[PDB]
Amino acid sequence: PMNPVAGLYAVFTGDPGNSNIKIMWDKPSVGGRDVRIRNMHVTSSATISDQFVSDNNLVFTREEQVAAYGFTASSVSVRAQEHDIESGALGLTTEYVAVPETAGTVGQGFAKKDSVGNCTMSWEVGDAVQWQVEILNAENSTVVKTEIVVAPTITWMAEEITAEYGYLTDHMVWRVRPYRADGASNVAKQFDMTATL
């Protein structure tokens, strides 16, 4: 017998409603089975879209879910339908309540400056694989560089810093958004520490 989709939760890649969600399920032992992709409104459980991808975890466009809802997807409930390709029979639709998923706490960032002049921002990997980081220097209080880096450590070249400001920065602030291995993410958590030589 076909099994209803299990382990289903909206896997936010950022802010709830401003990021992609992933349909996750355990692949059944029965071959040739894929899960339909849709999401339910809170009030009436409306269907957002319909597509079939064999991948166990897959990103879903945020614009489509926002357009179907008409507002930010802060609270969602997810429905998924599993289809057997060989038989061609669409299975029972399974709607389950979904809660926002938050990634593990980011490693406490450490700001240090080397003798060369590079401002090295290092936070341990911990339980997060990649992070969304916005980098702002405290002297100018502007986010000069914004990038989502998988590397646990961020190093800014001394040449680039000298070109940007003319001298090395002593204090510099950063914000990190965690991402677990499965792709779950939490609201940005800010760590601030002065660079130490």
> 67 with 34: CB under 8 angstroms?
no
Cα–Cα distance for residue pair 124/110, rounded to 1 Å = 9
Of 97, 64, 61, the C-alpha closest to 78 is: 97
Cα–Cα distance for residue pair 77/187, rounded to 1 Å = 20
Place of tokens 């950063």: 174
The single-letter code of the amino acid at 8 is: L
Report resolution (Å) to 1 decimal.
3.2
Surface-to-core class of residue 65, CB atoms within 10 Å of its CB (0-12 exposed, 13-18 middle, 19+ buried) = buried
Dig out the tokens for 23 from the structure. Answer: 């349909």
Contacts (Cβ under 8 Å, ≥6 apart) of 98: 8, 9, 10, 76, 77, 78
Contacts (Cβ under 8 Å, ≥6 apart) of 7: 24, 25, 26
SS (H, E, C) the chain: CCCCCCCCCCCCCCCCCCCCEECCCCCCCCCCEEEEEEEECCCCCCECCCEEECCCCCEECHHHHHHHHCCCCCCCEEEECEEECCCCCECCCEEEECCCCCCCCCCCCEEEECCCCCEEEECCCCCCCEEEEEEEECCCCEEEEEEEECCCEEEECHHHHHHHHCCCCCCEEEEEEEECCCCCECCCEEEECCCEC
Dig out the tokens for 28 from the structure. Answer: 């059944």
Method of determination used here: cryo-EM
Pairing type for strands 153-156 and 119-122 reads antiparallel
Backbone CA torsion sign across 140, 142, 147, 149: positive
Four-CA torsion 89, 94, 98, 101, nearest 10 degrees: -40
Cα–Cα distance for residue pair 171/154, rounded to 1 Å = 15
